[PDB]
Design a protein around this nucleic acid. Structure first.
Lengths: 146, 152
RNA sequence: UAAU
RNA sequence: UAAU
């Protein structure tokens, strides 16, 4: 009974209610402890603020990515993590970025957030926490100007 | 944060202009406004102490009466004290099976019911670390390696 | 093996 | 410096 009401609203809501539509679709689409013997891969995620407020003119994203992205790819490979630069100011063109933000797609919803690096690890527990610790130490050398 | 600068006003403007016959969308917009108006992001310039906790299952079902709790603690609890000190964690044995006497162990999360609902969950070890971020993850990984030696 |  |  409840999902058919949600779908009627999805279909009848005016497009300009981008946030309501997102919350409705999200609600529609909705239709543990670590066991150390079998030691299965677990997901760890951690967001790290880029200190833009305190360094408003430093080019953190450009330093993080490098030419053609190669600096961030090499840092990903040598830390065995995935790193995503997300949040306000994470794109090159701020006017383009703002239009994507306004589109309401979940793919661009992170643009409402503060500029951060999302570090994600998938590994057995002891190794996942170790990897994340090493990634945090290396990522400092990029986020703190010198 | 950029949420309080543009997301929240936007939510607010939608809630004010939504036709209230959309009772689900209006409900969900209102709940989302509520969620935002009431921990996750590392500030790596300040690098302040951060909390990390991880619960580690004691594998009672595969090993139904190997005495894990006894091996973890040792005499007067010294072996668990060693392990916390060497890893720089706090470690708490919790779940069902945690207390020495099974009889009362049932009654304590009947009635009273303030601090003891960890006795509705499986038996497990809670590992807690408090340290700057890179060190805190490093410490948890080390405590996870060290503690395997007690769960096999 | 019974700790905080 | 613009990756995913």
């Amino acid at each position: 009974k409840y999902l058919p009401e949600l779908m009627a609203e999805k279909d009848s809501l005016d497009p300009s209610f981008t946030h309501a539509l997102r919350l409705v679709n999200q609600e529609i689409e909705k239709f543990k402890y670590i066991d150390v013997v079998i030691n299965k891969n677990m997901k760890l995620g951690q967001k790290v603020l880029i200190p833009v407020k305190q360094f408003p003119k430093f080019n953190f994203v450009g330093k993080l990515l490098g030419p053609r992205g190669n600096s961030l790819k090499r840092l990903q490979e040598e830390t065995l993590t995935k790193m995503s630069i997300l949040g306000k100011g994470s794109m090159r063109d701020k006017a383009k970025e703002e239009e994507l933000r306004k589109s309401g797609e979940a793919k661009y919803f992170h643009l409402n957030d503060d500029l951060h690096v999302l570090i994600e690890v998938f590994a057995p527990p002891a190794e996942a926490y170790a990897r994340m610790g090493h990634a945090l130490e290396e990522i400092k050398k990029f986020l703190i100007p010198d």
